[PDB]
Amino acid sequence: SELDQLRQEAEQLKNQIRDARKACADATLSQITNNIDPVGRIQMRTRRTLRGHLAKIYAMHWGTDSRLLLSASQDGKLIIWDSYTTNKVHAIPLRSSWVMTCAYAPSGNYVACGGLDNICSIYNLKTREGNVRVSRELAGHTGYLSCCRFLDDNQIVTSSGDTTCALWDIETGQQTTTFTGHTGDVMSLSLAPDTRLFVSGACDASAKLWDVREGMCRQTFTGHESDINAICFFPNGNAFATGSDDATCRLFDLRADQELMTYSHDNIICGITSVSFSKSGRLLLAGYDDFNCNVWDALKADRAGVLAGHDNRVSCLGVTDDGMAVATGSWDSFLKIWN
Amino acid sequence: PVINIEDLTEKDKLKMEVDQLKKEVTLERMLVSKCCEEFRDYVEERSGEDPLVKGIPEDKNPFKE
Amino acid sequence: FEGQASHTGPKGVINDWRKFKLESEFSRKMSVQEYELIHKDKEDENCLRKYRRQCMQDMHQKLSFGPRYGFVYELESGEQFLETIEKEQKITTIVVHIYEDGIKGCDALNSSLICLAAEYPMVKFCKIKASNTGAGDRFSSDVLPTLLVYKGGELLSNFISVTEQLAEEFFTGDVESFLNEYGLLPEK
Ligand SMILES: C/C=C(\C)CC/C=C(\C)CCC=C(C)C
User: Phi, psi at residue C186, to the nearest 5°?
Assistant: First the structure.
């Protein structure tokens, strides 16, 4: 029980881990791609404008169909839009205006959200008795709900400011598995394409990969010197991108257990809060704290373009599963579709 | 697994930490260069079809005028 | 801004909540006291409305930079081009129009820009003949009319043959719409 010895062993273990990584850190991604011609200047255009919210958009999430999308706003309303016709499919009054995230079930049957209320509310979209009040309210986290992603109609994972992540059984409202490990507020989480694993970023400058079925942490990635605000899984599931306060996006590979590339530039000083890959994973779009968005070239580590021409109006963003569009939310209540 | 955070002690937190670390030390780590090669290959194979990179012809753009 | 995220995502929500309860009334971001407060304070809907409204206005106001221009400035040499994009406030959007008299669109664009510049005095509109850029033979007739948009030394967008993506007979409003659909123009 001697703490000194325990925390000492921890340090030596961490030391052993860093060296192992260094032994494998023989080259950077940029070198491997120094022969790959840069992508053409990415200049996306606004196609659709979603008008409805009465306040700052906090989060948004695309549906599997790459058409219907959800958007949580400061106005205390969750709206399901039809990106194609800018029409509002569902309008859902929330009990709080402070919503940090909003998930969309891969079946389109359910939608979820959470925030400073510390609860992950779930709503039923397809029903004779349509739901706008609530189906379930997953209460348990002793901290704000930062992020949540559906696994199916009955299971959903949620990250929280209480330093924990957790898998819930919607039908019971009970916390099936609790993922403990981070030493600070978990800011984001992202499911692997096969949903058997998922990674999470926290205010401890570390991203952790967890095995949903086993309920334990597989690997812990480090590199950022500040809180990791956003995290997004790569399409092939062998890696993921992170965004933190130190104004750098990092690409971590599972097998390598370390960062393959870092994305930054001397002019960039704002912390990154949103990160999303394109369909091919060639572009790493990053939304910064200054409401700007940079389209990075995942391969060459250089920025391929600017999303929204630096109009200081990007609070959140997300890419469609078919990679046909990027949706952005803003402090002025409007959302835009780009491609 | 089904752990309630606020109830853990400084000790068993470090215990779970060292346990996790021990497990992490035994990780079969792949060479960075190798991983980068595979990453590049995957991307390159699909980059040419990526709508956001190549652009979407107005003809097939779901978000018409 | 500068530093820790406090405008977007979870942290944005946290800070917004704080400002709300301040205007009307490390590893961890929120204090236990603040947590208890959320689970104890009954937020007045009216104050919520006023807050949401005021917040958007504050941003609207912080992004609205004073009218400093109003005319389409002519760049004689490529040097004047480099100097204008570098020696300029990072918050000021610069729209340069590389042109050549007599070329389809070049003239029409210039005309539209005259009024667009008056409509957006916060944006610096500049024009320069391809022959005056001195960039070898990169800005040619097959590229003209080219419209470059800079901001804080960063090249936001480079539009080749901009007019080909506008109506046969366009006006100021058309260029306005086009640039708005790219988030390249500030607000009025
Ligand atoms: C046509 C323009 C508006 C109705 C207001 C501006 C809309 C937005 C700012 C949506 C947020 C998207 C951006 C990245 C700009």
Answer: -70, -165
The torsion angles phi and psi of B44, rounded to 5 degrees, stand at -50, -40
Angle at Cα A96 formed by Cα A90 and Cα A97, nearest 5°?
A: 80
Count of domains observed in chain A: 1
> ∠ at Cα C18 (C14, C22), nearest 5°?
170
Q: What angle do CA C161, C165, C170 make, to 5 degrees?
A: 100
Q: Neighbours of B (≥3 Cβ pairs closer than 8 A)? A: A
Rounded to whole angstroms, the Cα distance separating A220 from A200 reads 10
For this PDB entry, the determination method is: X-ray
Q: Residue A73 is part of which domain span?
A: 1-339
Query: How far is Cα C2 from Cα B46, in angstroms, rounded to an integer?
Result: 37
Q: Do residues A281 and B42 lie in contact, with contact meaning Cβ atoms separated by under 8 Å?
A: yes
Architecture category of domain C55-183 in CATH: 3-Layer(aba) Sandwich (3.40)
Q: Are A220 and A207 in contact (CB under 8 A)?
A: yes
> What is the strand order of the sheet A197-202 is part of?
A186-191, A197-202, A206-211, A216-222
Q: Where are the domains of chain C?
A: 2-54, 55-183
**For testing the chain C interface, which of A47, A98, A99 should be mutated: the one with the most C CBs within 10 Å?**
A98
Cα A160 to chain centroid distance, Å, stands at 13
Asked if residue A93 lies in contact with residue A74, where contact means CB atoms within 8 angstroms, the answer is no
* Neighbors of chain A with 3 or more C-beta pairs under 8 Å: B, C
d(CA A3, CA A10): 10
Q: Long-range pairs for A161-169 at CB < 8 Å and ≥24 separation? A: A161/A185, A161/A186, A161/C10, A161/C28, A161/C29, A161/C30, A162/A118, A162/B5, A163/A202, A163/B5, A163/C27, A163/C28, A164/B5, A165/A189, A165/A200, A165/A210, A166/A140, A166/A141, A167/A212, A167/A215, A168/A120, A168/A138, A168/A140
The CATH-assigned architecture of domain C2-54 is: Orthogonal Bundle (1.10)
Local structure of residue A55 (DSSP, 8 states) = S
CB contact under 8 A, C8 and A316: yes
Return the number of CB contacts < 8 Å for A and B. Answer: 185
Distance A136 CA to ligand 1 centre (A): 33
Contact A112, A122 (CB under 8 A): yes
For position A211, which CATH number holds? 2.130.10.10
Which residue ranges form the domains of chain B, and what is each CATH number? Answer: 1-65 (4.10.260.10)
* CA–CA distance, A202 with A189 (Å, rounded to integer): 9
Q: Cβ of B59 under 8 Å from any chain A Cβ?
A: no
Helix axes C45-63, C9-23, angle to 10 degrees: 110
